[PDB]
């Protein structure tokens, strides 16, 4: 409320709530991803744990802006949580592709609300996703290309057993 | 690569690239410094340990900077390193006023690569400056300078007594 | 100092001298090794860790040269550090090809040093490169041919996954 | 005796028994600097310390040349030793200067056996003294070489100042 | 001697010494075949091992004939060691295939003395047979061709590949 709203714009708090939006719905994509790789007729038990800890670090993020959106005063306002963008997701090549086109697509979400900050001399607010949001995400892009360059690597002539390996040497813990 | 890098400047990695190799310029300086006091005809162990833990400091301040190259998607390019600037570095006064000399020359270079990351919107690259170097460098500085006024307050008209006592009561560890 | 210096000639001063330049010289170039199978496009976790140790170990071999130079009264003097030979490394067979070239000629140098010490008749320089050097330089090349014998074996028709399987069944760690 | 006697010369024999007299020389002249040092009107302790645990390292250096004389075969021989050169060693720089002269004459004589040695083509010896002796030789004197820097930074105008910091920071144990 | 001796025919006594022969001929193959896959251009480090173990087996049944043999108050009677049949070993397959031949020729000899103890009425020497030989044949022969069989499923169209992940996954230890 207003009794302590300082410095925080209605823009930025309009555009927290969308942020907030935009993990959820990450969230549950990474749901659907964990228990895709868990069906008996694809059964990749070291992608299904990468997906559902995903899942559980995005509702985090989640978590940690509506803290945060109470912290300045403002009010969190939800929105309908759009299905996920597949009801199938491939291979594991396929999956982490759809996943770091995830990824980005919130990075530029945090870089604009990050900029719109800056605009609004909020300096709080850029602390806020610099310190929580911004490193994470950078490492887990780099982690996922990682990912992705020995998934592409172990395609070769034999995907099923590349698969696999990757699986069990790289992900299974 | 193209496949993680995003909001990641051609400037930004060229200055990064540069900043390395200022950084193992730095700690090639401290290599030199260090073993010239462990000469025996200077013989001043805290001094040489001094800056020999200066030279492990910032070849760990190059690695910072190569990681973080390669999680934004940009690539390590390494140039020549040139030799250090004397062969023979004096008293501890002269070696501790060409640190900070030094010191203040990196500290502008960070200053600068903030400002351009500042300049291209770029939270990432300032975010880590700030978290890793900004206030590294400035204690580091203060270090030294308050060194700097205990080696001349011990100068007076007793030089070696004054460079002796300095290196055991304040550096020797 | 001539205040301690004996038996210890000009010539092997200065070829230690030039030993501690191809020693950080190699280092650095572990350094780039290293950093490069770090690349998102690369991401070989066990071939950059094995790289980066070499780069520390060449780097203590460069401080020990320099310690035993003051221990006999030489004079450390450096040089400008020649950049790595390659910016890319290529396949993890490619670069341990380049390892063992590196390491081939860093043994001969030391062979020659031997050589040098044995008709200068300078026996504490022949033990401290018998003791520090000569075996630790075989020890080492003997392991790096074993990887190579492994690279090559694991290439057949499937060069992706024989990448993969070596980087975590013998590196990784 | 014959009995195990092999590749064990005449010559290095006898050089062997004029080292272990030139170490028990040596042990005496440390036992006479250390109780100079602990006069009433000297009483310098840390100094006083310093030649007692040299006198017990030489002694020790001959002990280890009368066991390998019996490994090889060959038969101490004992000849009388010579007392020190002064009966009073003057300041602690003085007495450092002389110690150093001292141990560079034990050094040349490490230097002069091991030639025998390789002339006589005995490797044993030459190992001996390289593994026990010639780098435990060369750290004592870089010791005493960085000990003497120290010593004459702080003469100055304040002798006696110098003299008893040296003594209570460098050397009191 | 006559003295203990009792119940223990010349022709097992023969047979015994023998047998030792036989087993350290087996126990000098297997130190053959282990440092081959020492070799820099072959580097099976758990085939190493694996044959390594085995001629360390072999010394200690031979040791436990001779132990035997003295027990009974037979005299052991050593001959000349023949060399191995091979300088060098081929493939893991073509090492597992000779090593099961070699074994399968020490379990021949162990059950031609068996027989030959039988019908001397020989219990003692039967039972020490059975007791410590026999079975740990039998179990060592099945090992080597459980190993036979994987090296077969791994050769395929990718012997390489096979040869690594044999020794990665069933030998290194
Ligand atoms: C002279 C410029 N160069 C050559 C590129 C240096 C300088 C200093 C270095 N110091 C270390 C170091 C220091 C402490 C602990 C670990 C390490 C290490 O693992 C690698 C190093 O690498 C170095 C290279
Ligand atoms: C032959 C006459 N000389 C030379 C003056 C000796 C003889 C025996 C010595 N034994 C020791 C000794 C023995 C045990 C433990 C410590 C020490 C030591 O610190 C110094 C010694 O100094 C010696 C000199
Ligand atoms: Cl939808
Ligand atoms: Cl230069
Ligand atoms: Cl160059
Ligand atoms: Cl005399
Ligand atoms: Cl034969």
Request: aromatic share 10%; proline share 1%.
């Amino acid at each position: 409320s207003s009794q302590i709203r300082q410095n925080y714009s209605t823009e930025v708090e309009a555009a927290v709530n969308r942020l907030v939006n935009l993990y959820l719905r990450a969230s549950y994509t990474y749901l659907s991803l964990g228990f895709y790789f868990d069906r008996d007729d694809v059964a990749l038990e070291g992608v299904c744990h990468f997906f559902r800890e995903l899942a559980e670090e995005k509702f985090e993020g989640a978590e940690r802006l509506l803290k945060m959106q109470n912290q300045r005063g403002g009010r969190a306002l939800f929105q309908d949580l759009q299905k996920p963008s597949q009801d199938e997701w491939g291979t594991t090549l396929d999956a982490m592709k759809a996943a770091i086109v995830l990824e980005k697509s919130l990075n530029q979400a945090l870089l604009d609300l990050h900029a719109l900050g800056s605009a609004q001399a909020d300096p709080h607010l850029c602390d806020f996703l610099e310190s929580h949001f911004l490193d994470e995400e950078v490492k887990l892009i780099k982690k996922m290309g990682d990912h992705l360059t020995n998934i592409q690597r172990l395609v070769g002539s034999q995907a099923g057993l590349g698969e696999y390996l990757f699986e069990r040497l790289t992900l299974k813990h």
